[PDB]
């Protein structure tokens, strides 16, 4: 079908991109970076994340594929040496697709902005102390005092979530996971401490106590938000689709990245 | 229908049990502790766990209810003062039921024994060092060296799992969670560190490296197993059923138990 | 001798300050906020920290005393009701002094700035990724990738250090403690993970890998530093002195603040 | 002077031991395993620990040396290839000695037993729940509910202590460090959570609440103690002495063992 290729931009990835375009030129494939049906990312997980966010409005019509030119990534799980085999199998098609859940973040003011995350969304203060009330399905759960909070997708659990002590979740589980950044706990201030894993349709709301300015990140993007009244997290109804051509199980991918490869 | 009541055995719980039996005597209810359809547990979560394991062969035909005479429990979520209202609403019936997932443990030798857990199943060595190979869906994931491992149900995540750094999972998620006990990590021995959350139909297998004797716990029960060839964990096909009479959300229950009440 | 009083500035603390000044007026005491020999802090630990940094150039000639008008502080360990008894015992004098160690931070550029910390000094990046090489007594120890690092005094171990998983150290131990903020660990990036406790005369040096701009905090003060070549930590030769009038052991202070009071 | 050599007992270590004995036969050295002045340990840290405990009554008159035939140890820090150079430099003498602190454990009954630890001493229950009151210098600090507690020397901080989240302490610091094993924390049960570092002359006492039987380990030795009234921890007055022949800094040893070598 239609396809496009994004590159990390170093010499290795650009040349690999040109060679795949040349190989694709031998098949019934059209290069189209406006309405592609296949998006190939050549680089690392950062390059893949930019590809995802470049097309996050046509997620239902795109299958993503990542090629890692540096270290193995959790999204870029093809070696450059297999690019020719990848061109061939992609050109025929008849691959099967795999879907991972995504996280929806809603930021309300006094309008409203929504964001989609593949890895996670984090909230920190704009300099001063970070205090928010944590509201779960309209029930006041805790008053969090600390550095910040992180809400992760299942596939994001191997990223910032993991560094904060969160669990690794298999991406077939439609959930999101909330982890704390350096929470203050004494006899007057109390947080749950543990990571919290929320199912689909649960809404986690962050509500300011004093300051209403927050630094909110969504994957690699970080924006300073002002006059915030609420930050809303829930499992998205939208999903990212991967073209898969062989067996590379998530738990094997975790093994290769953190234990040995 | 038919019902039975188990008591913690202290004076408060026995008297409360006799009063509920007397109140039940005013309705179309029969006391039957062989084939009950309702099992009432009066005490704490330990009393409730014994009730669960007393009838773990009729789980499809029983709705459990817990009354806490001491501190609030995650399973015993009725106060003793509401016992009269509980008798009345139970006698009419037409309550609705809630189901939590359970964990299946299979221990193979050179026969085979299976166990059902409501909270968790743990494995430790019989004195010497604990070393096992961790196999996930037939893929060798890690060689674990440490004190032991804990596999928790969702409702068990607030128990031993929480003390080991595991995430708290909403019990509507059909999953199990594996946490490490004091893992050894240096440049030659490597574990994942993080808790791992597994979906339904994933099989986690523990396989001995040297010693084949292990102390295996299932909820409160702990047995020394000898000549073990494999320990197998998976989400059970069976589920525990709760009679629910009002709204007491899991996250509110977590708040009441760990933040304040 | 000479004395001064700093106030949190709310109504309660200012009035308490005026009453102590009036009570001090009945003794051989002179109010002098240029060269005081006693510095009284009325408020919380933040107020006490500002008092410390106000006079950090006359530390050898000052004994500090803290009165807590809100919650109990680790430095402000007098209740407001005892202020009259505090005035009386201070006026006579013949109290005994207790000294806590301090942390010296040196920031070098391409001049050089030094800072003294009572609680801790932290380093984070100026937006992008934080990567530094950690050098211990000229030996290259690790390449740290994460959110940042925190170096704490013994009395600071109950503050940010504690939130990052650090140990609590009795302040009679002349040491500093380095803790990690969300370190990245995989098969290519490796940090020690554990907190590190360094004795007097050990020098811990942070050296940039790519970016040379860092946000460095010293207690409550946080400054963006540019063109940094090295950040140097060591136990200071200078110490803070407390006037003590009764027994309030550090471990009792820890109990009162985190377990119950 | 007088010397003896202990071996791990595998072929490699025994042969290395015989070759060093033969090399020592060319100098003014006498093999004496009753009153040696030098104790050489050939194996790993377990072999070294047995050598330490074999002679823990002549600690003032012995300098220890460890040769690692397997992986690098924190106590066995000589390679087998340097054994000939080790024999030569040892025979002349005029090496300098380094001392590490040790932990004293006192177990009282209704007589009293004392133990010396090079790594750590741990306390667990004999099957049932572990509950002890933690008393610091006669001040009741906390009621600990969990799996157990671990008190570590500075050089022991890289061992079990590290696996429990404890800090790594440079062994020039005369201290001990207490870490928790899976503590239970909810709104009714409260522990400090953090590791605690105690200076010389502080006494940490564990006192039973219900059960009085405990499994107490001291380094590799683990004994079931019955009718215990108190367990007492303090930095020992005795110290282990190492013969050192070159520079191998503790922090470099930590780097080699956990980061890379
Ligand atoms: C440095 C830095 C930030 C992380 C870079 C690597 N990375 C990106 N995304 C992921 C992910 N989902 N799982 C594991 N690793 C990931
Ligand atoms: C002491 C001890 C063992 C734990 C007793 C309390 N307890 C039992 N089960 C649970 C559970 N599922 N969640 C939270 N708390 C629980
Ligand atoms: C919020 C916030 C920041 C911390 C405020 C309380 N605080 C200040 N200093 C300390 C300290 N040394 N030990 C314990 N608590 C402390
Ligand atoms: C398996 C197992 C138990 C630990 C074996 C290795 N080991 C022994 N002692 C130490 C120590 N002091 N520091 C680091 N590693 C040590």
Give a nutshell description of this structure:
Chain A has 261 residues and is α+β, with helices and mostly antiparallel strands. Chain A has helices spanning 11-24, 45-54, 83-92, 160-163, 250-258, and strands at 2-7, 30-31, 38-43, 63-68, 96-109, 112-117, 120-125, 130-136, 139-146, 148-152, 168-169, 175-181, 196-199, 204-208, 214-218, 221-225, 228-244.
Structure description:
- The structure is a homotetramer of 261-residue chains.
- With 261 residues, chain A is α+β, with helices and mostly antiparallel strands.
- The first copy, chain A, has 2 domains: 1-101 and 238-261, no CATH class; 102-237, Tumour Suppressor Smad4, CATH 2.60.200.
- Chain A is built from 5 helices and 17 strands.
- In chain A, strand 5 (96-109) and strand 6 form a beta hairpin.
- In chain A, helix 1 (11-24) runs parallel beside helix 3 (83-92).
- The first copy, chain A, is elongated, with a radius of gyration of 20 Å.
- Chains in contact: A-B, A-C, B-D, C-D.
- The A-B interface holds A 136-137, 139-142, 162, 165-170, 172-173, 175, 177, 190-192, 194-199, 202, 249, 251-252, 254-255, 258-260 and B 136-137, 139-142, 162, 165-170, 172-173, 175, 177, 190-192, 194-199, 202, 249, 251-252, 254-255, 258-260.
- Strand 11 (168-169) of chain C pairs parallel with strand 13 (196-199) of chain D, so a sheet runs across the interface.
- The structure holds 9-hex-5-ynylpurin-6-amine (4 copies).
- Chains A, B, C, D: One of its GO terms (biological process) is NADP biosynthetic process.
- Chains A, B, C, D: Its main location: cytoplasm.
């Amino acid at each position: 079908m239609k396809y496009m290729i994004t590159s990390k931009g170093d010499e290795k990835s650009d040349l690999l991109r040109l060679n795949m375009i040349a190989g694709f030129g031998e098949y019934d494939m059209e290069y189209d970076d406006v309405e592609p049906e296949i998006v190939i990312s050549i680089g690392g997980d950062g390059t893949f994340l930019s590809a995802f966010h470049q097309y996050e409005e046509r997620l239902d019509e795109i299958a993503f594929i990542g090629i890692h030119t540096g270290h193995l990534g959790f999204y870029a799980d093809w070696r450059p040496a297999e690019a020719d085999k990848l061109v061939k199998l992609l050109a025929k098609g008849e691959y099967q697709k795999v879907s991972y859940p995504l996280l929806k973040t809603t930021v309300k003011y006094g309008k409203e902005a929504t964001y989609l995350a593949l890895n996670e969304s984090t909230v920190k203060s704009s300099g001063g102390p970070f205090v928010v009330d944590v509201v779960i399905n309209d029930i006041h759960f805790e008053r969090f005092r600390g550095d910040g909070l992180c809400m992760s997708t299942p596939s994001g659990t191997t990223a910032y979530n993991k560094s904060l002590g969160g669990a690794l979740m298999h991406p077939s589980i439609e959930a999101m996971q909330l982890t704390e950044m350096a929470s203050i706990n004494n006899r007057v201030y109390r947080t749950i401490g543990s990571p919290l894993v929320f199912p689909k349709h649960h809404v986690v709301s962050l509500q300011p106590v004093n300051d209403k300015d927050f630094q909110i990140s969504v994957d690699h993007l970080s924006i300073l938000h002002r006059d915030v009244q609420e930050i809303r997290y829930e499992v998205s109804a939208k999903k990212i689709h991967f073209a898969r051509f062989r067996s590379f199980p998530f738990w094997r991918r975790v093994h290769d990245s953190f234990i040995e490869d």
